[PDB]
Amino acid sequence: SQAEFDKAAEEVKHLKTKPADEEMLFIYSHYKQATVGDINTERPGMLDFKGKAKWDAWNELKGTSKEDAMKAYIDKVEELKKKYGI
Numbered sequence: 001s002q003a004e005f006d007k008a009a010e011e012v013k014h015l016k017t018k019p020a021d022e023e024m025l026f027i028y029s030h031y032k033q034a035t036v037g038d039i040n041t042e043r044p045g046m047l048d049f050k051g052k053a054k055w056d057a058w059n060e061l062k063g064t065s066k067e068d069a070m071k072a073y074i075d076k077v078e079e080l081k082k083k084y085g086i
């Protein structure tokens with residue numbers, strides 16, 4: 001793992017706003033892969049925007065490598081910074 005990623009996790013959660021879905025979706029899938037990996041949970045079903053989008057976005061990366069997902073995750077947090085603050 002690469003702690004800077006977790007640090008990014010704190011930092012992103014500090015964003016004075018909850019970013020737009022796409023940006024959220026990226027952080028979510030990247031964080032979910034970066035930490036969990038092979039999605040093995042269920043499909044929310046009930047909700048779409050917050051249930052399938054964020055599950056789908058992660059299923060779409062089901063077999064990735066932590067560290068990479070971290071770089072992109074963190075780099076996304078950096079991108080967010082510009083738009084939302086951090």
Ligand SMILES: CCCCCCCCCCCCCCCC(=O)SCCNC(=O)CCNC(=O)[C@@H](O)C(C)(C)COP(=O)(O)OP(=O)(O)OC[C@H]1O[C@@H](n2cnc3c(N)ncnc32)[C@H](O)[C@@H]1OP(=O)(O)O
Nearest residue numbers: 009012013014015017018021024025027028031049050054
């Ligand atoms: C529309 C579809 C995509 C977005 C769906 C919503 C969830 C997206 C998670 C990705 C990160 C979102 C960051 C938004 C928050 C900010 O950027 S700063 C926000 C100021 N806003 C508010 O106070 C209102 C919104 N706040 C929140 O959502 C936070 O209070 C939050 C709940 C994130 C605090 O986290 P915590 O209480 O510690 O844990 P959970 O409540 O379990 O976290 C919520 C979901 O996010 C996943 N998660 C946890 N930590 C991270 C990091 N670092 N990156 C990405 N995702 C993270 C949790 O797993 C949970 O999702 P899930 O398990 O999929 O249901």
